[PDB]
Each structure stands twice: as structure tokens, then as C-alpha cells.
Write a protein that binds this DNA or RNA. Structure first.
Ligand SMILES: [Mg+2]
Ligand SMILES: [Mg+2]
Ligand SMILES: [Mg+2]
Ligand SMILES: [Mg+2]
Ligand SMILES: [Mg+2]
Ligand SMILES: [Mg+2]
Ligand SMILES: [Mg+2]
Ligand SMILES: [Mg+2]
Ligand SMILES: [Mg+2]
Ligand SMILES: [Mg+2]
Ligand SMILES: [Mg+2]
Ligand SMILES: [Mg+2]
Ligand SMILES: [Mg+2]
Ligand SMILES: [Mg+2]
Ligand SMILES: [Mg+2]
Ligand SMILES: [Mg+2]
Ligand SMILES: [Mg+2]
Ligand SMILES: [Mg+2]
Ligand SMILES: [Mg+2]
Ligand SMILES: [Mg+2]
Ligand SMILES: [Mg+2]
Ligand SMILES: [Mg+2]
Ligand SMILES: [Mg+2]
Lengths: 8, 56, 110, 127, 109
RNA sequence: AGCGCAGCGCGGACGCCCGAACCUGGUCAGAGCCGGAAGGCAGCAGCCAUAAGGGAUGCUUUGCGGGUGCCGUU
RNA sequence: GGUUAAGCGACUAAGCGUACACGGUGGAUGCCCUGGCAGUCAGAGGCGAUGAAGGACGUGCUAAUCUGCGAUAAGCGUCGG
RNA sequence: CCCGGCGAGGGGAGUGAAAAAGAACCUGAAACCGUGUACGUACAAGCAGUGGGAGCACGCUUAGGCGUGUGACUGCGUACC
RNA sequence: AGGACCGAACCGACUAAUGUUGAAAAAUUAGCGGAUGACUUGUGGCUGGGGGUGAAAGGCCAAUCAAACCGGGAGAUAGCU
RNA sequence: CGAAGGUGUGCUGUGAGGCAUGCUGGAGGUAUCAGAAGUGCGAAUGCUGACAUAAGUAACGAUAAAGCGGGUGAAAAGCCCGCUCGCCGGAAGACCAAGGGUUCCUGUCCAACGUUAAUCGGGGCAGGGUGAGUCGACCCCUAAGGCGAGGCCGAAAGGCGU
RNA sequence: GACGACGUUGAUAGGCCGGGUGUGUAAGCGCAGCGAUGCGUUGAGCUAACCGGUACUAAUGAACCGUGAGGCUUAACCU
């Protein structure tokens, strides 16, 4: 989920 | 309590005399070579010399 | 412009702000605070902001890093005043003009 | 004022001043420092220190106020167990004041009062 | 509880695929051309951003509100980028600290 | 009562430690630049060493100040 | 020229005023009309149970409001330019 | 690009013949409100000017007795409709 | 039983202070009168201006009443200001 | 190679005014002699608008007063969390009708609006949100009263009514 | 606003010690009484703006404004 936010 | 002719100019411009603001003048205290505010030691840490508010 | 900043609107009336301004002139500059930071009146918090913005324009429009300067000018002007109404004695004593000003700070050479 | 020595008040009911001043008094004991006007401050210590002196007793006397000046006997218990024996030495004096000043919106002095550790006198460094 | 030191690690932890098949598919409803604009060959900016951070001191990486023109004209001199390039990183980072503070459990709704 | 010493204290060297994001140096990933290649140039973070400038301490040298200790001398 | 007297004695502006400089406020003035305001000439003098005038509500790729239009809904057919 | 609260507001840079055209936007007057400078001004009574008038600040001229501002002191002297 | 007694709700307004550019274009505070009655109240209906309604004061008929409000005759007339 | 207009100046006329020109200004103006007037303001408790004055004065709306520690934030007396404290409780609680017509909930933003500050709101901008065979309205029934085929009246309008 | 006192070379405020004063014999414990209650501890407990005293707390070291020998003329004193 870390990549689904920092990249979102 | 009504008034009648009143001179905006000159008059009032005279009462304003007693209305100008004023200046402080205070130190820095040993540690803070600046602030110290007024009769305080320093706000940076709120310490006169040590553990007072937050410091070392 | 010989590094200015001034203001417009916000709202703080003229005389109100014209009072704190008198406090600062002549030397100024290095007085970005103290002669201002140690006086609390709304008018003060407003002149300081623009004061710094002005002294900041000393790294963009012109050189002369912040340290010299003078602040040979500070004057506030009457800016458009907002109008509103006020319920009172059936509606007679109601005008209310919010009033507003600026500051227009300057910093030239001595 | 009128003519001589009387005093102690701020816009408030003396019927209620007791609370507006007791809760605050029990706070210093709960903590140490509390910013609250030079007035409330310069006025605060007369309820804190005088209630501090109730140490030597640590019996019925100290308990002249537990179930009253605070719903819970926390602050009071904290007294005859901690605060009382702490400053046992130089009885006189206790809480100090340090000007803060300016409360935002209504330019009123602040200060915050304190106790030992570095009061009007001083203290070491630790704890 | 967050800064450049932690944001940088998030870039190094991209060893495994780095999202070559993950983030590349985290957008079914592509906006005509959103994919390539994000990945950018995975080196057009994805790599530059890191380099710009590597040329930063422990102080700058800790405090982002202490960098001035004197520091911006230095990072670009070492990294090889420009002044506006270094500014973009700071801007995109400013919107990160504001987002990584207004949530709790996923932050979804 | 006056000095010379011991000593205390203090300042400057030496040894150790610490110590400038760039304008100090060496080494310099990532990145940048030149060329048709092969190969170089410039250079940041970090690491090591090292000035200006500090510190703990052992104490050689040493300017000056002390006047407690307290020999001798006028 | 040194003190002591006597006689005079301008320099200060908290502020105020006049003159000029520069601004602010404000919106007059000048300039301009796909808006009005008389009339000439020439038409036309009526629309409506084949459902009017006037609207409500809908109808666009989103679609708030006008303008259109009506569940065939910024339109459908057809002849002409 | 820079100050700022990722404000307001502004300062540069650029557009432009012009931004002393920046959206409050043509020209922008008056009342009214300021900053600056020259002079008058804190023992003097009143429609505040007018007549006389020294001084002061600038400007005069190959002096020649002047121009502009301001006006101490003084004779007069109760706005318009 | 009672247009009976005392007294909240509810209905009303005798007194004083305050308010009088109000909290308020009639109220607030402390008292005060009626409180099973010619009582009190919700909803809806009916009376229209020289007309209504009126336990009657010229009271009420939308903060308006010795003749409502709106539009018209209308630029009434004004030997007056 | 700068019209009208605005502002200064100089010359000129008895005066109403005339001209020349600095500056502003950004497009038009009009000798002359003649012609026609919405033809000339200081007042009418004149009309419209703008800005003064009083004056940074009164006032900030029930005397049920609040203190403190955290959080957030550019900033917190007022917002969120917590512990105290006080106020109402035939209510200052809860539900519904009338009336209102998104004020409801979430996220956001703080210009204007909140008689202050405002990160907060019944404010702005977004979204979301009211699910019935049994509750209500429709719907059967009729009251007061309204309307009223034909009808009776009445210059017309129209009144009354089976 | 002003005006007086004091700012560590200190009693100027607050606190603290003692006393005064005013209230009226606390709390707790013991005993009597079935109990209300009473008695003893006890003239206790509490106690303000007061009096005597005490630096415990706060009154910090500096900084600011105000200068640098005082116009001309004459008379009297002078070398
Ligand atoms: Mg009470
Ligand atoms: Mg015709
Ligand atoms: Mg303009
Ligand atoms: Mg004089
Ligand atoms: Mg004359
Ligand atoms: Mg009765
Ligand atoms: Mg009265
Ligand atoms: Mg009553
Ligand atoms: Mg009764
Ligand atoms: Mg009714
Ligand atoms: Mg009426
Ligand atoms: Mg007629
Ligand atoms: Mg008439
Ligand atoms: Mg013309
Ligand atoms: Mg006239
Ligand atoms: Mg005030
Ligand atoms: Mg007054
Ligand atoms: Mg007053
Ligand atoms: Mg209120
Ligand atoms: Mg709404
Ligand atoms: Mg809500
Ligand atoms: Mg809302
Ligand atoms: Mg009928």
C-alpha cells in the first residue's frame, strides 16, 4: 500500500 | 449632546498629539545576543540559565 | 521601483495602521522587528509582514544584501472601504464602513 | 483606592472566585507550570503555598481538604506524600513567576508560575 | 516522523521490479497517456530525483525548510540538473508530508 | 617592609580528540559533458587526512599575571 | 580677556497652518455605441378547439442559465437557395 | 523566479507601442485622506481677510534696490441667501 | 351545585424601576387580575370601505383608520412658503 | 512629428471669457459669418452618488462567570481531546405539526458572512444523504362554507340557487 | 497619567515563623445513655486586609534619553 499512496 | 459646526482639519489633528505610539528598549541578555524580549532572558528556549521551560 | 512592497485591502483601517508606521522610519531595516515585534496592535503584524517582503526584495530587484538599507519611506493611504448595514433603532443609525489601507514600505540609500 | 489595604479580585464573583482559583491551584500540584495572566498568577500562590504548608501534620490536619477541593483525593494525596516533604527545608516561599506576556487577541500578560526545581531560588539538574 | 532520509529509502527499495509491472498496471483507466508520463522510461526523472537527493547533506535531508538559493545552485551543480529541477522535487515533497499526516488506516475514505 | 624563587593561575606551541553545504585538498558511486570509437574533462553526497578555530587531560617549553606557600636576600 | 550684576537675547516644536512635490480615495469629464427615443414610405391588421396568448417541466458529450425544441425534444422529413 | 499561511498582497522577469493599459484595467477632475520640503507658530483674543509690513527659504541681475513661497508686528474690520 | 373560594398552566395588563439612537417600532424585572367560564386555544370558513365588525373607545379592518391599501382621473387646486 | 478632456504657466479683455504653451492624454476637433437651443446653479428641510464630522467615541444582545494540560495550526481565551467547574431539567431535554426548503452527513477552504480571532459554523465549493401493502397524503364520507346543468333575477358586468 | 516607598549595598509586594483578633471548645479517640444527645480530651479547632520578624519567591548585569565648561553690550571688581 506504500506504493499505492506515494505514487497515487 | 448634539454638536454644530466642527473643523475636521486642524482640530482633532491636535488631539492626535497625545495619540502617537511609543518605543521599548531592552537587552539581549548574556546568552541571546539579541532577542531577550523585554525584561525576559530569552524565548528561544525560555531559560534564564538552564532547565526553565525547555532547554538543555 | 527602489525596492518597495506595499499592500492593498486585507482591512485594518488607515489611522489604525498609520499609528504603528510612525514607530518605524529613519534607521529601520535592521529593525525588521523589535521596534515592531515588540508592539502588539493588529496594524503592527501587517506592517512587519510587508516590511520583510520589502527588505526581501533586496535580493531580487536590486542587490545590496539585507544589512544596510534605510527605509526612508512609510505611508498608508485610505483604501476602498466596504459598506454594510446595522440593525439598530428601527434602521436609522446604520452605516458601517470597514475601511482598509496598505503600508507601502521603502528601502533606499542613506 | 478608597483608603488603605484590602484587595484580591478580578472581574468575577467572589462566590465563584473560589473555583476559578481552586481548580487552577490543584493544577500546579498536578503539574508544575501553568501560563495564566500575571494577575491570576500573582494571585494564585496564596491558595497553593498556604495549602502546601499542610505537610508537618500529615494527619487529620492535612486532610482538612480532600473530599472537597477536588472530587478525587489525587492532588491532596500528592501533597502530604510528595509536595509536602519535597520543600520541607526553606518553608517560606515556593512558586515563582516568569513573565511570558501577550495572549493573542487580547494583549494580556501570561507568565505561568512554577515550583522548586528552579523557583525564585534555584535547583540542581537531574530527574 | 518523516523526511527526505525516509523518502530516499523508498527509492532504493525499488530494486525488485520497482513497479515495472506493478505501478505500470495500477491505472486500468489510463487517461489516454498517463502511464509513460509517470514511469518516463524509468530514468527520465525516476532516477534524477534520487541523484538530486544524494547530493544533499544530512541537514538538508532532515529539514526541507532550510534550503535557499545558495543550496539550490549547489545541488544542481553536482547532480547536473538545473535550479527549477531541484525546486520541483521540493514541491512534490511538500505535498507528501501533508498527505502522510492526514490518515490512519489506509486513508481510504 | 622591598625582591628573587617554589607554587597557583593564565596565554601561546607540541601530542590526542573534535572541527567549514560551496568558496580547502586527495579519493570520488549516481548524474553531466567531449568524440565515429577506444578513452578523458569537470564535479556533489559520503569516507579518510588535515588548517583557522575549541575541548578533556598528561604535562615539556614558554610570555605575563600573582603575593596563598613562604627559603634566602636588601 | 577672568567672575558678579543690569539690559536685552535668537535657537524648541507635542502639534497646528499656508505654498509647492508625490500619491491615495473617488468617480466627473472627453471620446464611443450591434441601446433607446419621432417619424417617412410601404406592408400587414389578427392567433385559438387542426387546441392559442402565456408558462411548468423536460431535452446537449458534462450541462448552471439564456436561446432553441418537445419523450421523433439546439431537433425529424421534403423542395428550393 | 522571490517574500508570504502552497493566503492576501506585492516585487522582478517577460507580453505589449504603451501594464504611468494587469483584469479595481481608457481619459481619470472635485470633495475627502496622507508623506516630504520652505516659512509662520506654545503670553495671545473675535467672519480669519484686506492695507501696511520686517524677517527667513530659494531665484535676480557685472549693485541697481526686484520675482516666488511664507508670513511676525500693525490700521481696519460681525459670512452668503 | 356554583359567570363560588385559594392557586400553577393558560388568558389578561393595575403599579414602580429600567429601557427611550432599546434586547424590543410597547418589552424586561418585581409585584398584579381571571383561572369550569359572557373562559381559553388550533385549523378552516363568512362579513369590504361611506362599507364591514364593534359588551361602544370612533375602537378594530395587515406597525395605516373622523372613512383601508394599490392603480388611475392627475402635472387635482394652492390669491401660500 | 499627438484632437477632445484634465492640469500648470504666460500674455490679453471692462467682464462674461480669449489665445499661446509646458505636462498629462489617446483619438478626433472646427476660424469665420449665419442658424437653432434640454443654453450657463450656491442655495429650493432640491434629486443621485462619493467622501467627511462626531471618533477610534458608544456599543459587541440577558450577570447560567470559568480554570488548566494536550492536539492541530502561520497564529488558539473561543476549534478537537481530556479532567475539573458552573447552568437548565413541566425544561435551556425528547418528539411532531405549522412554516422553512438542503439548513442534514463527509471532505475541504476562511475573501465576504459570524458585532472580535477563527484552524470553527446554519458561510463558500464539492460530493453523499432521506428506501413503506400496515405512518401520512392521495382515496371513500360528509361540516362551516364554496361552486353550481337547467332555473329565478338583474342596463352589461353579474347576484341567488335545485 | 500624576505622586510616595523599595529593587539583592534589599523588607517593596507575596509566602513563612510568632503574637494579636474574631469565632466559640474542631477532627479523632474514650466513656455515659436504647437513642437524640452529653462529658472528657479542650476554652479546642480554624482565623483577613493586622503587629513583630524572616530573603523563601519575585524585585537581574547592562541598555535608553540627557553632554563635552555656558550670546552680545555695559558697570563694578583684576594682572
Ligand atoms: Mg452562591
Ligand atoms: Mg402607415
Ligand atoms: Mg485609468
Ligand atoms: Mg512667541
Ligand atoms: Mg499689501
Ligand atoms: Mg370563579
Ligand atoms: Mg423613564
Ligand atoms: Mg410579570
Ligand atoms: Mg385565582
Ligand atoms: Mg383564523
Ligand atoms: Mg392597525
Ligand atoms: Mg383633470
Ligand atoms: Mg401637483
Ligand atoms: Mg465636442
Ligand atoms: Mg442664489
Ligand atoms: Mg479600543
Ligand atoms: Mg466625545
Ligand atoms: Mg468614556
Ligand atoms: Mg454575547
Ligand atoms: Mg447551502
Ligand atoms: Mg452540520
Ligand atoms: Mg455549510
Ligand atoms: Mg352561487
Amino acid at each position: 500500500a506504500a506504493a499505492a499512496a506515494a505514487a497515487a | 449632546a448634539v454638536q454644530q459646526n466642527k473643523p475636521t482639519r486642524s482640530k482633532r489633528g491636535m488631539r492626535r498629539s497625545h495619540d502617537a505610539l511609543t518605543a521599548v528598549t531592552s537587552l539581549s541578555v548574556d546568552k541571546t545576543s539579541g532577542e531577550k524580549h523585554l525584561r525576559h532572558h530569552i524565548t528561544a528556549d525560555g531559560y534564564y540559565r538552564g532547565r526553565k521551560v525547555i532547554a538543555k | 521601483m527602489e525596492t518597495i512592497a506595499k499592500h492593498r485591502h486585507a482591512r485594518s483601517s488607515a489611522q489604525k495602521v498609520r499609528l504603528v508606521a510612525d514607530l518605524i522610519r529613519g534607521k529601520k531595516v535592521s529593525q525588521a522587528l523589535d521596534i515592531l515585534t515588540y508592539t502588539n496592535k493588529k496594524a503592527a503584524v501587517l506592517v512587519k509582514k510587508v516590511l520583510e517582503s520589502a527588505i526581501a526584495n533586496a535580493e531580487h530587484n536590486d542587490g545590496a544584501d539585507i544589512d544596510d538599507l534605510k527605509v526612508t519611506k512609510i505611508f498608508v493611504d485610505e483604501g476602498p472601504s466596504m459598506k454594510r448595514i446595522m440593525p439598530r433603532a428601527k434602521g436609522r443609525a446604520d452605516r458601517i464602513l470597514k475601511r482598509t489601507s496598505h503600508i507601502t514600505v521603502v528601502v533606499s540609500d542613506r | 483606592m478608597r483608603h488603605r489595604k484590602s484587595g484580591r479580585q478580578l472581574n468575577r464573583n467572589s462566590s465563584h472566585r473560589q473555583a476559578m482559583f481552586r481548580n487552577m491551584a490543584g493544577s500546579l500540584v498536578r503539574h508544575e507550570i501553568i501560563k495564566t495572566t500575571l494577575p491570576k498568577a500573582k494571585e494564585l500562590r496564596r491558595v497553593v503555598e498556604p495549602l502546601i504548608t499542610l505537610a508537618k501534620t500529615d494527619s487529620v490536619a492535612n486532610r482538612r481538604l480532600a473530599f472537597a477541593r477536588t472530587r478525587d483525593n489525587e492532588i491532596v494525596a500528592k501533597l502530604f506524600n510528595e509536595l509536602g516533604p519535597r520543600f520541607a527545608s526553606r518553608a517560606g516561599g515556593y512558586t515563582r513567576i516568569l513573565k511570558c506576556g501577550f495572549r493573542a487577541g487580547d494583549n494580556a500578560p501570561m507568565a505561568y508560575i512554577e515550583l522548586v526545581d528552579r523557583s525564585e531560588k534555584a535547583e540542581a539538574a537531574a530527574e | 516522523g518523516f523526511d527526505l532520509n525516509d523518502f530516499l529509502e523508498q527509492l532504493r527499495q525499488m530494486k525488485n521490479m520497482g513497479g515495472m509491472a506493478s505501478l505500470m498496471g495500477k491505472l486500468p483507466g489510463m487517461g489516454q497517456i498517463p502511464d509513460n508520463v509517470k514511469s518516463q522510461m524509468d530514468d527520465k526523472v525516476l532516477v534524477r530525483m534520487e541523484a538530486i537527493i544524494n547530493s544533499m547533506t544530512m541537514k538538508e535531508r532532515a529539514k526541507p525548510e532550510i534550503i535557499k538559493g545558495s543550496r539550490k545552485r549547489r545541488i544542481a551543480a553536482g547532480s547536473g540538473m538545473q535550479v527549477q529541477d531541484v525546486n520541483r522535487l521540493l514541491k512534490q515533497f511538500d505535498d507528501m508530508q501533508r498527505m502522510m499526516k492526514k490518515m490512519k488506516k489506509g486513508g481510504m475514505a
